[PDB]
Amino acid sequence: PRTRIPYKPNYSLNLWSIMKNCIGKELSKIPMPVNFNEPLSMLQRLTEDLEYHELLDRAAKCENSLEQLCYVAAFTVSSYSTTVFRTSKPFNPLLGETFELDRLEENGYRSLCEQVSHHPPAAAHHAESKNGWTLRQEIKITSKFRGKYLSIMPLGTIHCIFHATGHHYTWKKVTTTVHNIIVGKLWIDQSGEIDIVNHKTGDKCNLKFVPYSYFSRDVARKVTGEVTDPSGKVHFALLGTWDEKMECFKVQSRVMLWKRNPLPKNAENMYYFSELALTLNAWESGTAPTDSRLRPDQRLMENGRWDEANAEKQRLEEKQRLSRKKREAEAMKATEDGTPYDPYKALWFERKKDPVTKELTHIYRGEYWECKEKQDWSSCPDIF
Amino acid sequence: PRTRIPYKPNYSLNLWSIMKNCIGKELSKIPMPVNFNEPLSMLQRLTEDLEYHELLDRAAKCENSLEQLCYVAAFTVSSYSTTVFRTSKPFNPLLGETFELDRLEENGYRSLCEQVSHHPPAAAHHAESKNGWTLRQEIKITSKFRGKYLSIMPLGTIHCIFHATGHHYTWKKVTTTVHNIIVGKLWIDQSGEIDIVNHKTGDKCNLKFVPYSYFSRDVARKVTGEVTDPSGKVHFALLGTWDEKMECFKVQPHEAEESRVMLWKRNPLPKNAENMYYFSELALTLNAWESGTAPTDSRLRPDQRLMENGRWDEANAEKQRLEEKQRLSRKKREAEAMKATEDGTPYDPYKALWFERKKDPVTKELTHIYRGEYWECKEKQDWSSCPDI
Amino acid sequence: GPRTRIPYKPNYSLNLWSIMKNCIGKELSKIPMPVNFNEPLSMLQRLTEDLEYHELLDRAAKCENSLEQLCYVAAFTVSSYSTTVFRTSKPFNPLLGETFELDRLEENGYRSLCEQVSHHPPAAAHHAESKNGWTLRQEIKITSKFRGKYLSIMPLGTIHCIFHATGHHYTWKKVTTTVHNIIVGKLWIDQSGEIDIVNHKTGDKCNLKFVPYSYFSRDVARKVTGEVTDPSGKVHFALLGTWDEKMECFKVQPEAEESRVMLWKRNPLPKNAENMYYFSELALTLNAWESGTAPTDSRLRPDQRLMENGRWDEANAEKQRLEEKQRLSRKKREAEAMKATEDGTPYDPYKALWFERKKDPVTKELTHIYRGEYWECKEKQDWSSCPDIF
Amino acid sequence: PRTRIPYKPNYSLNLWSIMKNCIGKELSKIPMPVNFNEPLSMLQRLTEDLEYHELLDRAAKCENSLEQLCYVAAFTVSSYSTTVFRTSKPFNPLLGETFELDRLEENGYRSLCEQVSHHPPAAAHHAESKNGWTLRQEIKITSKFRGKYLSIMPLGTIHCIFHATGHHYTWKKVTTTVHNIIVGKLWIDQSGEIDIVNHKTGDKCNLKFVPYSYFSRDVARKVTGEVTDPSGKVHFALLGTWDEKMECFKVQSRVMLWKRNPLPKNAENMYYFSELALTLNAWESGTAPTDSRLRPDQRLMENGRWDEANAEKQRLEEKQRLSRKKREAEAMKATEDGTPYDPYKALWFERKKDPVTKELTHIYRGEYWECKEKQDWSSCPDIF
Ligand SMILES: CC(C)CCC[C@@H](C)[C@H]1CC[C@H]2[C@@H]3CC=C4C[C@@H](O)CC[C@]4(C)[C@H]3CC[C@]12C
Ligand SMILES: CC(C)CCC[C@@H](C)[C@H]1CC[C@H]2[C@@H]3CC=C4C[C@@H](O)CC[C@]4(C)[C@H]3CC[C@]12C
Ligand SMILES: CC(C)CCC[C@@H](C)[C@H]1CC[C@H]2[C@@H]3CC=C4C[C@@H](O)CC[C@]4(C)[C@H]3CC[C@]12C
Ligand SMILES: CC(C)CCC[C@@H](C)[C@H]1CC[C@H]2[C@@H]3CC=C4C[C@@H](O)CC[C@]4(C)[C@H]3CC[C@]12C
């Protein structure tokens, strides 16, 4: 495993200087350097949901459906434990970029995500486990800069299947807002409601993320929840804070669920990366040529070689723009010649209608690991 | 009731010349004149869903919940009956623009739409009827021009509640594509699946819109469907074409009339509709001037009235003026937010007038719901709105 | 090895829509066009190209499970359409007595033979026996219709595949083929419809659905889905793919890609095939000179060889000569029938040489079955020299 | 009911003079006057298959599927009882021409035929009975004149459904040849095999029609048959002649006997019409405007007005030709303007894939009798 990555240098670049006039625009359309990023891609950032994968591993061994949903809800809230300290923008991943995590013997799963689209940005992620579950999602990130705060709505639906019982849990994301852009330290806060539904049994769960108010009495970053049966009974209750702990009680004896693992040593200068976040961008053999570990500007930023990372990002973005212009030119030729035109489609994911949520979602085809074992790539375009 | 609008002028403007290099761009970001529009706003076009409101009126008188879902399924398809001929772009409504339709004695409902946002574009629609139902929705229109076709996806969820029984139906729209852009003559095609769900009684309905193919041996523009009970299966089956008719039969594993419970037939277009933008009989009466409306109603938009009366060149100049006023107002709001952000002073962002953004308790989505205050303010005739139009 | 390169296609600018402008609703056989839109192959050779992926049938003969064998046969039915994606040229309308052989026992493992049995309506009988334990036969009557936007081609007929070792007799029809975008020039082909395979020995069935290409669709282009059922109605194997590239048959139980039983990948086009009528690696060696064939073989047709070497201007005149020769011969047959009917003398009508028109015992239809006399006569080289069609 | 039609006039026109040079052509492409026709359309001639509907009426009351198949097999031969003397060509129906037979109380069925396609000629026929059966078919008439004889092959598949048991019998027609055209004295002969298959039980039946030979092997116009179970046993045996009778014996002695109804009085001068064939072209109320009873040239020829009937047939053929040219011009405009084009479709029949025969056939949609009840029509083209 790989820990201790080089620290963040001090270049004194005022964030407000670039985002001064860019009020009301999307974060993707805001030209930014690499100084305010972290050496991880959005795919690597998204795969971190499996940081507390033991919750799903223990949930697979629950006979009671309601108690299993209590475990699933704790897994939904556990993902925001990295949001307390990590206040950096991960690299906007390229159109064909992917990222794998083949950690079956050490952890028990094989994760794989790939950018399905860039206009608009969307990323499909799928992870298979040997303990009897599978987690998949397609996240389309939308954002808006209002001046005082930066609002981020990671749109999309997350699925979690349990092969032993057939339980299919699904839930949406919560809205995330980042404060203190002009001056002072940066901090993040989630607010809204997450509604989990089990389509196999009919169980539901409602989690409420309370926004921070000074005179609210409500503790900061508080999360309350209730898991209900198809009839109406409240049964179990959830309480905690997404910054520290989360416990599951019963109503009619306290079971307790999730406590975040502490940050590694001297992590204050390593972008506040978790112990799992360190091993994400470690070089690995047998990955696809479009994996995030091979992105040049990301590695150039990880080792502290800035200024050149800006130029490498500029070149990579110009490459993607020329590829898009060529694809549009092919479509323009095909529409005038009368020939059919087949647009861009994702490589390892297919856009089909989800049978339970009735949503156009990207599902894993099931041929990435086979091709990785056989080491037959090439297919993947020259992205970097 | 207005029965005929001035005819459509003949201006020779090549559409492909404008969208030649505009490959991959959004329709809102496509600089085009008023020549390829219709004298209706997107709010009025969205209000046209109530054209076949008799289906919901008869659905309110259905004791069987499954048969009521059979009526609602035909109501979902009835909205696409107007797309067969009308291949014109409705006016992109301004930020504060609204549109009312207070037709209780003539039709039996009160419709109200308002453009809720422009980044991204969203429009909230709410219409309550005295016959026992209410229809509401928030439509965020997304579009993309890929060359061969221009795809339009009206994202959003539509609700239809029956207060007497409490039935709450919800369904999404289907993907619409307009083809043949290089050459003048345009044609439209719908394709995809509509999934209706009743949240009070667990029964569901699935409609399948078959795409038009170069060589297909099915009927053109055919739609098939099934009505299933909660945790069961097919109780009714419906089939037809969104070009003309839609029939809903019953299954029991003779001729056609014996096993058919509900038929829907579209009313034909009025006389000389070839020169009136192929407007329906209901579409003609939408942009007729009415007294007692809000100052932001679509009937008062200068671009539409200038184009309806055939004064297209002035409509182009006026649309450029209206869009520049909206852009300057947006930049002024951005400057106010920037100064409040630097000084620490509080800032009140833009909020919709007649709609409030709350989480829907059944669909768990942040949608704009009508705050019952438009009709009450209309009777007292006090309007503290904006000067967008 | 065999022939791997033919002379290139010349660049002759002839507007196709100018000829098919007024001929709306007519058959492709009755529409007068030059040789510019043809390929140096006959319909008999084009039909013989069905045996391109015979490895699927070779492996199917070695399947103990009947249902598992049906997956290989089902992939063989779709494999023939892998060549239609780019090759959009009209094969020569063969003469009435024209034949075509393919005696490839050591190199491929079969003996194929085709003969035009009739021209009114057009019909061609094909029969190919293999030493790997199977036999493929068919009679294809090609009907067509030009509707304006597209040219519809329906190769009507029933094709059979028998396995001598087990007695399995598979039967299936072809799918509808349409060539679109004729008005401008850059024309393209698409198949659509359903193939229904039936095993008459066991009762297993298979259904393949070819989805038509549509203006807007969010599924894969040229997609084909299929299911194989036992005589009771239970779906054992399921297959999916695209006739543009691949076709896979997995197993269902009514994780990943571990249930895969049979994958079929199309053989890529040879080098510089861009200018060789997009011929496959097998399509090139079809019109290569062969010894010991019948005098009515397609390799001896003057129009194909005259056009293959790039002399299209003379190939048009030779096509006119052959068509007028065939028409005069048919007028001679009609005059003989009229004289024999007025004189009361018996009349012996035209009958096929290497095929016999008998009732098929399985499909109960009047089909042309191989008589069993072509290869034997080829060994002794005693051709009848009576047709004289070229 | 109609029991006597006007007699056939005597016109001295040599048929061989017209078909002298038309050897090898299709009967549809051979220009002929009305002198060699009969006052019936091809739809009415095809509807004459229901002449011996009592066979299906008794077949619906048969418990044994094999014994029922003997009745069905006799019904297949019963249709050829009229061809022994009737040597006239029915009128080639127009594109929109239909023909109804609403005889529920008198016979027990509702028949409807429609010319579904022209070029090539095709006719769909459907008849539902209240006695427990339904008969449907789509017949594409193909022909060829070889000089001595005219070969006619009525291609298509005929279906017979029994609602009580679900038995679905299917069989094709047999080839019919008309000889002695040069002299003038016409005679007809059938030859070939009819193969009936029951898809619900698996029973099969094979009928052999022997052609006329000079060496006269036993009886003329003989028909032999066998009724077999799905295993292989020849439970029943069939014998008879399509000239008179047809009987079904048992093997290890008479279950299903078919006797031909004789021709009515003075039928020698009425085109040898059967007792049912006379009532076919009788005027009926409440019919569609495209029914064969309203065809002008056909009725003009029925009353002996031949010379004028030729001109009326020329008018109808040119009208249909102009309509087809208009359809072709619409398609030519649609292909160049890029607008979609929807070709001609049948009115009362839909061309779908049959679930049992897996073939593209025209099935009755079920809307003719309802529209007859409401008496609207109009929607039908101006065919006459
Ligand atoms: C520095 C400023 C300008 C921008 C910072 C943006 C950062 C804080 C945003 C951008 C996208 C966000 C992520 C979007 C989606 C998810 C998945 C969820 O299951 C956990 C939170 C997580 C992982 C978010 C964490 C915060 C995040 C990384
Ligand atoms: C002029 C060219 C470039 C663009 C034309 C775009 C037209 C055809 C598009 C733009 C907006 C579209 C509408 C958006 C939403 C709805 C509501 C739905 O319930 C029925 C279809 C309907 C009413 C659409 C019909 C087609 C439409 C009017
Ligand atoms: C160029 C224009 C004028 C006409 C083009 C006609 C071409 C495209 C047509 C004519 C006959 C057709 C062939 C007829 C039969 C078969 C056998 C089938 O198993 C695969 C397709 C195949 C091999 C067809 C391919 C397309 C084909 C070659
Ligand atoms: C006058 C000369 C030139 C041509 C005469 C053609 C006549 C004899 C032919 C043309 C079409 C034929 C019919 C076609 C189909 C059927 C249906 C079958 O179930 C019984 C025989 C029957 C009813 C045929 C009887 C003979 C028939 C009427």
PDB file of C-alpha atoms in Angstrom, chain A residues 68-147:
ATOM      1  CA  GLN A  68     -30.402  -4.270   7.018  1.00  0.00           C
ATOM      2  CA  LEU A  69     -31.896  -0.992   5.834  1.00  0.00           C
ATOM      3  CA  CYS A  70     -30.500   0.628   8.985  1.00  0.00           C
ATOM      4  CA  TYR A  71     -27.073  -0.582   7.865  1.00  0.00           C
ATOM      5  CA  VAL A  72     -27.669   0.679   4.311  1.00  0.00           C
ATOM      6  CA  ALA A  73     -28.696   4.131   5.550  1.00  0.00           C
ATOM      7  CA  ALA A  74     -25.578   4.324   7.685  1.00  0.00           C
ATOM      8  CA  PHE A  75     -23.616   3.543   4.531  1.00  0.00           C
ATOM      9  CA  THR A  76     -25.376   6.396   2.730  1.00  0.00           C
ATOM     10  CA  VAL A  77     -24.411   8.874   5.429  1.00  0.00           C
ATOM     11  CA  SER A  78     -20.858   7.495   5.817  1.00  0.00           C
ATOM     12  CA  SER A  79     -19.816   8.832   2.389  1.00  0.00           C
ATOM     13  CA  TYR A  80     -19.812  12.440   3.657  1.00  0.00           C
ATOM     14  CA  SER A  81     -17.154  11.769   6.318  1.00  0.00           C
ATOM     15  CA  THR A  82     -14.463  12.946   3.887  1.00  0.00           C
ATOM     16  CA  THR A  83     -16.340  16.196   3.237  1.00  0.00           C
ATOM     17  CA  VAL A  84     -15.486  17.598   6.680  1.00  0.00           C
ATOM     18  CA  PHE A  85     -11.805  18.177   5.857  1.00  0.00           C
ATOM     19  CA  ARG A  86     -11.404  17.667   2.093  1.00  0.00           C
ATOM     20  CA  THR A  87     -12.239  21.033   0.528  1.00  0.00           C
ATOM     21  CA  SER A  88     -10.529  20.620  -2.852  1.00  0.00           C
ATOM     22  CA  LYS A  89     -11.923  20.268  -6.360  1.00  0.00           C
ATOM     23  CA  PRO A  90     -10.980  16.899  -7.895  1.00  0.00           C
ATOM     24  CA  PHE A  91      -9.847  16.981 -11.499  1.00  0.00           C
ATOM     25  CA  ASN A  92     -12.666  17.217 -14.012  1.00  0.00           C
ATOM     26  CA  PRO A  93     -12.073  13.820 -15.640  1.00  0.00           C
ATOM     27  CA  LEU A  94     -11.729  13.526 -19.393  1.00  0.00           C
ATOM     28  CA  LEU A  95     -14.335  12.039 -21.713  1.00  0.00           C
ATOM     29  CA  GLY A  96     -12.836   8.549 -21.963  1.00  0.00           C
ATOM     30  CA  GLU A  97     -11.135   8.472 -18.561  1.00  0.00           C
ATOM     31  CA  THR A  98     -11.709   5.464 -16.317  1.00  0.00           C
ATOM     32  CA  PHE A  99     -10.489   4.291 -12.917  1.00  0.00           C
ATOM     33  CA  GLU A 100     -10.357   0.738 -11.571  1.00  0.00           C
ATOM     34  CA  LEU A 101      -9.882  -0.652  -8.063  1.00  0.00           C
ATOM     35  CA  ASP A 102      -9.365  -4.427  -8.179  1.00  0.00           C
ATOM     36  CA  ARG A 103      -9.145  -5.031  -4.437  1.00  0.00           C
ATOM     37  CA  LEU A 104     -10.849  -8.406  -4.040  1.00  0.00           C
ATOM     38  CA  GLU A 105      -8.347 -10.252  -1.829  1.00  0.00           C
ATOM     39  CA  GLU A 106      -7.563  -7.306   0.485  1.00  0.00           C
ATOM     40  CA  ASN A 107     -11.002  -5.656   0.724  1.00  0.00           C
ATOM     41  CA  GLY A 108     -13.449  -7.855  -1.147  1.00  0.00           C
ATOM     42  CA  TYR A 109     -14.569  -5.917  -4.203  1.00  0.00           C
ATOM     43  CA  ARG A 110     -13.810  -4.779  -7.723  1.00  0.00           C
ATOM     44  CA  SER A 111     -14.724  -1.147  -8.371  1.00  0.00           C
ATOM     45  CA  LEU A 112     -14.723   0.483 -11.798  1.00  0.00           C
ATOM     46  CA  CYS A 113     -15.887   3.937 -12.841  1.00  0.00           C
ATOM     47  CA  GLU A 114     -15.739   5.733 -16.174  1.00  0.00           C
ATOM     48  CA  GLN A 115     -16.790   9.152 -17.421  1.00  0.00           C
ATOM     49  CA  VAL A 116     -19.812   8.435 -19.567  1.00  0.00           C
ATOM     50  CA  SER A 117     -20.108  12.051 -20.736  1.00  0.00           C
ATOM     51  CA  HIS A 118     -18.482  15.484 -20.534  1.00  0.00           C
ATOM     52  CA  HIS A 119     -21.285  17.690 -21.962  1.00  0.00           C
ATOM     53  CA  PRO A 120     -22.877  17.308 -19.493  1.00  0.00           C
ATOM     54  CA  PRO A 121     -20.372  15.739 -17.063  1.00  0.00           C
ATOM     55  CA  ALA A 122     -21.551  12.324 -15.887  1.00  0.00           C
ATOM     56  CA  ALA A 123     -19.707   9.372 -14.359  1.00  0.00           C
ATOM     57  CA  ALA A 124     -20.865   5.758 -14.056  1.00  0.00           C
ATOM     58  CA  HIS A 125     -19.490   3.632 -11.211  1.00  0.00           C
ATOM     59  CA  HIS A 126     -19.994  -0.077 -10.519  1.00  0.00           C
ATOM     60  CA  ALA A 127     -18.491  -2.261  -7.786  1.00  0.00           C
ATOM     61  CA  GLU A 128     -18.969  -6.013  -7.313  1.00  0.00           C
ATOM     62  CA  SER A 129     -18.419  -7.703  -3.942  1.00  0.00           C
ATOM     63  CA  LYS A 130     -17.656 -11.266  -2.908  1.00  0.00           C
ATOM     64  CA  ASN A 131     -19.829 -10.950   0.227  1.00  0.00           C
ATOM     65  CA  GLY A 132     -23.088 -10.918  -1.734  1.00  0.00           C
ATOM     66  CA  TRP A 133     -23.720  -7.327  -2.858  1.00  0.00           C
ATOM     67  CA  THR A 134     -23.167  -4.889  -5.706  1.00  0.00           C
ATOM     68  CA  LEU A 135     -23.153  -1.089  -5.705  1.00  0.00           C
ATOM     69  CA  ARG A 136     -23.741   0.972  -8.832  1.00  0.00           C
ATOM     70  CA  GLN A 137     -24.561   4.570  -9.649  1.00  0.00           C
ATOM     71  CA  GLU A 138     -24.468   7.234 -12.337  1.00  0.00           C
ATOM     72  CA  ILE A 139     -23.688  10.702 -10.986  1.00  0.00           C
ATOM     73  CA  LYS A 140     -24.212  13.819 -13.111  1.00  0.00           C
ATOM     74  CA  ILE A 141     -22.762  16.752 -11.159  1.00  0.00           C
ATOM     75  CA  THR A 142     -24.535  20.096 -11.569  1.00  0.00           C
ATOM     76  CA  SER A 143     -23.365  23.238  -9.792  1.00  0.00           C
ATOM     77  CA  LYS A 144     -23.922  26.981  -9.445  1.00  0.00           C
ATOM     78  CA  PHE A 145     -21.745  29.747  -7.979  1.00  0.00           C
ATOM     79  CA  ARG A 146     -23.834  32.309  -6.091  1.00  0.00           C
ATOM     80  CA  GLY A 147     -20.957  34.396  -4.725  1.00  0.00           C
TER      81      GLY A 147
END
